[PDB]
Design an enzyme around this catalytic site. Structure first.
Site, mmCIF file in Angstrom:
data_model
loop_
_atom_site.group_PDB
_atom_site.id
_atom_site.type_symbol
_atom_site.label_atom_id
_atom_site.label_comp_id
_atom_site.label_asym_id
_atom_site.label_seq_id
_atom_site.Cartn_x
_atom_site.Cartn_y
_atom_site.Cartn_z
ATOM 1 N N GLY A 236 -12.965 -3.558 -5.497
ATOM 2 C CA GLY A 236 -13.181 -2.247 -6.105
ATOM 3 C C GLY A 236 -14.236 -1.336 -5.496
ATOM 4 O O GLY A 236 -15.147 -1.799 -4.811
ATOM 5 N N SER B 136 -11.523 -1.123 0.534
ATOM 6 C CA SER B 136 -10.194 -1.194 1.157
ATOM 7 C C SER B 136 -10.171 -1.972 2.454
ATOM 8 O O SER B 136 -9.179 -2.631 2.775
ATOM 9 C CB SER B 136 -9.642 0.211 1.446
ATOM 10 O OG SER B 136 -9.339 0.934 0.264
ATOM 11 N N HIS C 281 -3.707 5.219 4.677
ATOM 12 C CA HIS C 281 -4.385 4.041 4.154
ATOM 13 C C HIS C 281 -3.747 2.698 4.497
ATOM 14 O O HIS C 281 -4.414 1.821 5.025
ATOM 15 C CB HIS C 281 -4.526 4.201 2.646
ATOM 16 C CG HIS C 281 -5.467 3.237 2.006
ATOM 17 N ND1 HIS C 281 -5.034 2.144 1.291
ATOM 18 C CD2 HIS C 281 -6.816 3.258 1.880
ATOM 19 C CE1 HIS C 281 -6.070 1.539 0.740
ATOM 20 N NE2 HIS C 281 -7.164 2.195 1.079
ATOM 21 N N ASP D 129 0.800 -1.216 0.000
ATOM 22 C CA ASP D 129 0.000 0.000 0.000
ATOM 23 C C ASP D 129 0.841 1.277 0.000
ATOM 24 O O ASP D 129 1.876 1.345 -0.667
ATOM 25 C CB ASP D 129 -0.911 -0.041 1.231
ATOM 26 C CG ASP D 129 -2.238 0.661 1.006
ATOM 27 O OD1 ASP D 129 -2.330 1.892 1.224
ATOM 28 O OD2 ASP D 129 -3.194 -0.026 0.592
HETATM 29 CA CA LIG Z 1 -13.257 -1.454 -10.692
#
Ligand SMILES: [Ca+2]
Ligand SMILES: [Ca+2]
Ligand SMILES: [Ca+2]
Ligand code: NA
Length: 466
Positions: free
Chosen positions: A186, A260, A86, A45
């Protein structure tokens, strides 16, 4: 006899353990004695705050590196906006320290956690490959909460080096058992994006993970597709709780959100599973997920029963991960037979698409050959076609046993005229079905517009055993 975490924020980690039978059943795994001890997980990340009070105790330098600045220290780059928080948030979900009076706990609170700083800079194929291929014999699981932009109009995936990294990983990683690659499906729900238009999630080498809101609904950001394998909880509306984890500047947050947050939880559960059985191969792991995931409680408009009696949804794959069930099944698991691959080129001539096109083909799945498959795993429909307005297309693939996988749903923002060039749409929905018989490919123009195009190639690729 087991004593659960005393961490101040554990009670808010509703997804780990709850009094509503609506959780990931992680405590049941801890009670069976699995906490991730001996397993190494790396978060690819924007960096990891290795000195965070809830991470330091489990931090592992050998599972870390800074690809963006080319040094071994993955420390995040601090900015007023806290842009690089993140990775640290994802790391805590996996292995935040337990019983230390700080924040909450990770799913695998005894696992070693590392971080590869690779999103804070130009993210090239080389950058990706070096991250995915970092210490394949030390790191067991790689977690990736990133990918191509979710604009709902692009088709993108790993370039060559990254592909090679994936392949070397499942072939040679973990002493030949294969690196475990966990991916976030996603955040393009609002743009009507499809996770089959993402080569990282669509790959058979990655376990693509989707999200479910606390009340069991498909989050607004969720992307539907047939390549998704399973689901873990994440955020939803403002009446629903979110993810509690470690935050930048040694803080604790209760608002980690989106796609995420799902992959890391899956990575943690998989870490507990490997502790229960260190000899599981990358394929064994996918089998365990398919078998133990629970649909119950999750609401979806497309739940359907496949050829072997399992419920599947394009929003959730096989459903919610069940840690207790995962670790239980892992213990008695017999390694699956060698992976076979049966290639079947279907077209004998180009086919005009028009308003609707249907292609039927009876296959024997390599009967009589070394790659004969009677028990399917992943299946790909590699298509090459031209079309004036790509997003108006919807593509479905029906297995001989009647399982209908939607390879591509309409994407209203996709006005591309470039079609698909040998794109390998993948589906996990016919897992364990017998693939011999008639397969049907359906391509339809979902719009009223007079669109035109031609399907020039359709290769059916079956992976599995006998
Ligand atoms: Ca996507
Ligand atoms: Ca550095
Ligand atoms: Ca803690
Ligand atoms: Na995948």
């Amino acid at each position: 006899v087991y004593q659960e975490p005393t961490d101040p924020k554990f009670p808010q980690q509703w997804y780990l353990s709850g009094v509503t039978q609506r959780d990931l059943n992680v405590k049941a795994a801890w009670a069976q004695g699995y906490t991730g001890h001996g397993i190494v997980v790396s978060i690819l990340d924007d960096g990891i705050e290795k000195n965070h009070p809830d991470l330091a105790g489990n931090y592992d330098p050998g599972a870390s590196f800074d690809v963006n600045d080319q040094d071994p220290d993955p420390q995040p780059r601090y900015t007023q906006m806290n842009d690089n928080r993140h990775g640290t948030r994802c790391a805590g979900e996996v292995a935040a320290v337990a019983n230390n009076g700080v924040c909450g706990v990770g799913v695998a609170y005894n696992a070693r956690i590392g971080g590869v700083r690779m999103l804070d800079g130009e993210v090239t194929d080389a950058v990706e490959a070096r991250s995915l291929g970092l210490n394949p014999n030390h790191i067991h699981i790689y977690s990736a909460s990133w990918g191509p932009e979710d604009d709902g109009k692009t088709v993108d995936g790993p370039a060559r080096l990254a592909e090679e990294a994936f392949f070397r990983g499942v072939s040679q990683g973990r002493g030949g058992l294969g690196s475990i690659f966990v991916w976030a499906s996603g955040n393009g729900g609002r743009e009507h994006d499809s996770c089959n238009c993402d080569g990282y999630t669509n790959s058979i080498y990655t376990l693509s993970i989707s999200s479910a809101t606390q009340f069991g609904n498909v989050p607004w950001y969720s992307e539907a597709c047939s390549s998704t394998l399973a689901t873990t909880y994440s955020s939803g509306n403002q009446n629903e709780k979110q993810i509690v984890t470690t935050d930048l500047r040694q803080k604790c947050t209760e608002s980690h959100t989106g796609t995420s947050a799902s992959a890391p939880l899956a990575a943690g559960i998989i870490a507990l599973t490997l502790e229960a059985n260190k000899n599981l191969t990358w394929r064994d792991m996918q089998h365990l997920v398919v078998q133990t995931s629970k649909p119950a409680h999750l609401n979806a408009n497309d739940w359907a029963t496949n050829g072997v009696g399992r419920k599947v949804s394009h929003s959730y794959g096989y459903g919610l991960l069940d840690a207790g069930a995962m670790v239980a099944l892992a213990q008695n698991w017999t390694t699956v037979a060698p992976q076979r691959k049966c290639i079947i080129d279907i077209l004998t001539e180009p086919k005009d698409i028009g308003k609707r096109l249907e292609v039927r083909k009876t296959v024997t799945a390599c009967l009589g050959e070394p790659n004969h498959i009677t028990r399917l795993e992943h299946a790909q429909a590699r298509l090459t076609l031209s079309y004036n307005r790509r997003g108006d297309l919807a593509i479905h693939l029906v297995s001989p046993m009647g399982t209908r996988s939607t390879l591509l749903a309409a994407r209203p923002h996709d006005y591309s005229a470039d079609g698909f060039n040998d794109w390998a749409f993948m589906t996990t929905h016919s897992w364990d079905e017998d693939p011999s018989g008639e397969w049907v490919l359906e391509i339809e123009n979902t719009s009223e517009a007079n669109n035109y195009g031609t399907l020039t190639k359709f290769t059916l690729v079956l992976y599995g055993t006998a």
